């Protein structure tokens, strides 16, 4: 069939047209407002008047940057029947292309190796052609714990993967599946299926015990063989990589390159399992038992050479892939991000195999997080951002690279192996299966060295740029600068589940990390103003936004201090508001509320989570962006586990903004109640707006106390206590 592989959902006209006309009247009203403010000067506070008009101009400019590319959201969903009729063949074969899957991990003791095991078991059990899906695991630490975990997973896959394929286990994650209380009651059997469930329960429990005793086993084995201590492999050879005991040639960061294939190429012919027996009673007559690629790589690290952490790790991965499989399509994932929907691979390949797929370079996938409470008190999902801004940018040209859960096309971008990848017909390199022989191993070792990065352009002028923090948006920019588009997918259930940031300390660390990366990429030469003329103005302004949003803080701090300064000095922002001015403010507020409700309606989200994410992003702008900008200027010059809280200096900056405002509210209240200007009537509402400020500074203020901040029964009492203390103090003097 030729039915289009992508179902489109358009916004209703009775909603889309009011949305755009309301954005238009919003911009017109802002132009009228800024004209009014410029014309009507404030001689009493002329410096304050200039600062206020500049701040309002900046806020409106940021709002324009944020709302201009959200004008025309279009929803996009895939389908599978068309792929299964066109590219799937009933004879057991297929015409699908190849695909590479990257799993990146940094260090076994800070990140849970159980997450890596779940991810590799999910990708190994994915419903994709076996001979074309090639897996790479970048263990940046180079530890034998991960090596033997992957080896034992390869041994265990011969009985795990056929079960997953035959009985429709979803998600492919083992612990996620065994944690599913209800289960969809899938499975071709009932009694055999439940017997298999219990036996795999026991076997996976003993498998978990082996995992937890693996370090004990390996250290006993190393002691036995060694009685510069190496990590002896199972065949008695010498591990030449990162030794636990370091010396001149084997200190951390001084090793060579290694290419080893744990699980070699499966046979092209379909393999049937053993018949009915006692040890393996599992009936495997109609189930394929082939085993996909599994290769290990350890990139070269030299002193004085910037290995560039995950970016360089994945560059080494993709350089090795172009030799081992030469797959044009390449998806990457982190250690903690595992597959929840096994059809994400097809949902990504459908766009790559559909019509006009040359322009689409990369596809981003939904980044979902687990462990969030059903009430969603703290908004760990970041739904109002992911499905709010990216889901709207998807509509006309495509989203941006976000950091993980994305697939790339490489034909757009080893010197003598380039022709094999750049040949017009790459399908001739997969018919003759290349075995992991000594010739291939030695050529990979020769041409995967880091010595080729000197005097060449890889990283410096194409590929993933170095000396930068966030590779995602910068790579998206360098990719779109040549003239390519992108697509996105949004399917239920979640395609991938990742580990949400754990506890406050590193939550603050990672928000600071994001803000610092944004500021660093801004500091570089990739300013969108001098971009290539081919770039459309819409993604130009989107790039301007995504690279200068953290500058809101420098004016937001001033705007939050304005109420306190005004209430302590007796000066208003506008000395005497007029009828037209009040009408304009009322219209602006009403139009902002209507925009908010319209976007909540069309984004499939709720007002509660919208408001919570707004609170969080206000708090982030207040604290983390200010910390990032001060750091950048300084550098230029020179469940229950969630309830553990540790003090850090980085939190001290919101505190003052809390307390000066709390003091100033009661100071102004007493100033007015002393009898200065009795009639509050039509200026009434400011205190309510103050309560509004309270509700948008509520999240972090509640969460700092932590476990004792279980309920506001203490927080509100302390707030009222401070309020009454400062009221009494100002009344006294």
Automatic annotation (TrEMBL):
Residues reported to bind Mn(2+): 310, 334
Molecular-function annotations in GO: cellulose synthase (UDP-forming) activity
Pfam family, one: Cellulose_synt
Superkingdom to which the source organism belongs: Eukaryota
Membrane topology: Multi-pass membrane protein
Transmembrane found in the keyword field: yes
Active-site residue list: 140, 472
Transferase keyword on record: yes
GO cellular component: Golgi membrane
Gene Ontology biological-process entries: cell wall organization; cellulose biosynthetic process; plant-type cell wall organization or biogenesis
InterPro entries: Cellulose_synth (IPR005150), Nucleotide-diphossugar_trans (IPR029044)
Binding of UDP-alpha-D-glucose, residues: 110-111, 140, 309
TM ranges: 19-38, 45-65, 549-574, 581-604, 616-638, 650-673, 679-701, 713-733
Keyword tags: Cell wall biogenesis/degradation, Glycosyltransferase, Golgi apparatus, Membrane, Transferase, Transmembrane, Transmembrane helix
Coiled-coil residue spans: none
UniProt subcellular location: Golgi apparatus membrane
Protein name, entry field: CslF6
Annotated source species: Hordeum vulgare
Gene: CslF6
